[PDB]
C-alpha cells in the first residue's frame, strides 16, 4: 500500500509460513530455515482486532417505533412516514459502505506498514555488515551460522563482533 | 351499510385517557355504548408486530 513492501518490493508471500504473519527466511553455511516473527505479527493482529471491536460494537436496541408497511393508501402522513424511513436507510447504507471502504484501505496500508517496519529495524541491526538485495533480502557479508541468524531474529546481534570481517568482504574483498 | 355479520349498523370506538385527579363524565341521550371500567396504562419497552412466523 502506502509503503511498498507488500505486493511491492517483496515479490510475493509465503504460502508456507503458517506460524506467523511476518517472518524470516535465511540461507547460511549450515543450510536454510524459516521462522515467524511473533512481535510484528501481533502488532498487526492487535490493531486489526482493535478496529474489529470498534465496528461490531453495541447494537441499535429500539422498541416501539413507527409503521413501515402499509395495507391501505392514506396520503400525507403515510407519505412522510415512508420518506422518514427511506431517507434513514439510505443514510445508514452510505455510512456502512464508506466505513467498510475506509477500514479496508487502512488495514492494507497498516499491514504493509508493519512489514516495512520489520525490514527497517532488521536493516538497522545489520549496520555495515550487510547490503539489501532489493527484494526484502539482506546480503550478510560475513560468516553467519544459525546462532548468528537467531541473534538477528531475536534482536541481539552485535555488529561490531563481525564488522571488520563484513567490511572486508564488502569492500573489494 | 353493507351487511356485515347480519348487521347494517356499526359502532364507532373512541377513547379517553383520564389523568390522576381528573374526572370522567359520560353525558348522553342515546346511542351510548358505555364502558365497564378502565384499562391500566404502563410506559415501557412494549410494542406490536405483524407476522405469521412461528414462535
Ligand atoms: C340499502 O341497500 C343495500 C344494498 O343493496 C341493502 O342491503 C341489502 O339488504 C339485504 C336484506 O334485505 C341483504 O340481504 C342478505 O344477503 C345475505 C348475503 O347473501 C343473505 O344471507 C340474507 O339472506 C339476505 O338476503 C343484502 O345482503 C344487503 N346488500 C348489501 C350489498 O349489503 C339495504 O337493505 C338497503 N336498505 C334500505 C333501508 O333500503
Ligand atoms: C538470540 O540468539 C542467540 C543464539 O541462538 C542466543 O544466545 C540469544 O540468547 C537469543 N536471544 C533471545 C531473546 O532468544
From Swiss-Prot, chain B:
Highest taxon above the source species: Viruses
Protein's name according to its UniProt entry: Hemagglutinin HA1 chain
Organism lineage: Viruses, Riboviria, Orthornavirae, Negarnaviricota, Polyploviricotina
